[PDB]
């Protein structure tokens, strides 16, 4: 009564967007180390039971189409959904290989009124990316 | 009825306005921590318990290293945003 029902055939789909190389026009550098993260995340989430797929160096349009298509699938037999985004970013936005795109746009596709098969089911988004230029000096 | 914005959970590597650190040879701080906690507790702890331990791990076990004194010895704390309506366990 206080826990999400996990008694489904599948735990769910897991999308991992691993953006490492960017177009010179963006001015963003290569994200070395992101392949180690992607492979680590792949094994972890696979172990949990997710059906994971990794997409590399996605453009903004590709990311939008990726999330849109996923929300249009039939999650009737899944317990939840997970999406992991690895890339450069700024407050409220994440970088594609060719530019930036609002994080809200990527996730809105899963709203209760746009993805009936995930209604009342957890929708998880893990995001590795900058959200500004402030530095934390720490203390003591 | 159910709010259309309900049941979402966002686990960010850092708080709004801040940088997020990544080690070229070991990967980002956030993912290294998230993976080690999930490998050892992914199936016995609730999602918020897992992410809270990730927060502590990133906050205590990492500290930036750079030549430029401006980015030397910096810290990081992840940010968890929850609109969940129930507890979430990855099992049974």
């Amino acid at each position: 009564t206080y826990q999400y029902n996990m008694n489904f055939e599948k735990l769910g789909k897991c999308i991992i967007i691993n953006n490492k190389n960017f177009d010179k026009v963006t001015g963003m550098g290569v994200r070395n180390g992101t392949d180690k993260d992607a492979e680590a995340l792949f094994k972890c989430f696979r172990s949990l039971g997710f059906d994971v797929i990794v997409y590399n160096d996605c453009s903004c349009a590709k990311m939008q189409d990726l999330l849109k298509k996923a929300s249009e699938e039939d999650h009737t037999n899944a317990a939840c959904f997970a999406c992991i985004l690895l890339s450069h970013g700024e407050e409220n936005v994440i970088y594609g290989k060719d530019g930036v795109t609002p994080i809200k746009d990527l996730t809105a596709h899963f709203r209760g009124d746009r993805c009936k098969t995930l209604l009342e089911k957890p929708k998880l988004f893990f995001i590795q990316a900058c959200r500004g230029t402030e530095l934390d000096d720490g203390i003591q | 009825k159910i709010p259309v914005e309900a049941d979402f959970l966002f686990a960010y590597s850092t708080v709004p306005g801040y940088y997020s650190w990544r080690s070229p040879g070991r990967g980002s701080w956030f993912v290294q921590a998230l993976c080690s906690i999930l490998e050892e507790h992914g199936k016995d702890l609730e999602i918020m318990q897992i992410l809270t331990r990730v927060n502590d791990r990133v906050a205590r076990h990492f500290e930036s290293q750079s030549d430029d004194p401006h980015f030397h010895e910096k810290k990081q704390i992840p940010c968890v945003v929850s609109m969940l309506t129930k507890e979430l366990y990855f099992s049974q």
């Binding site: 994200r31 | 940088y19 650190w21």
Partner: peptide
Amino acid sequence: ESMX
């Protein structure tokens, strides 16, 4: 380390 680098930043994201």
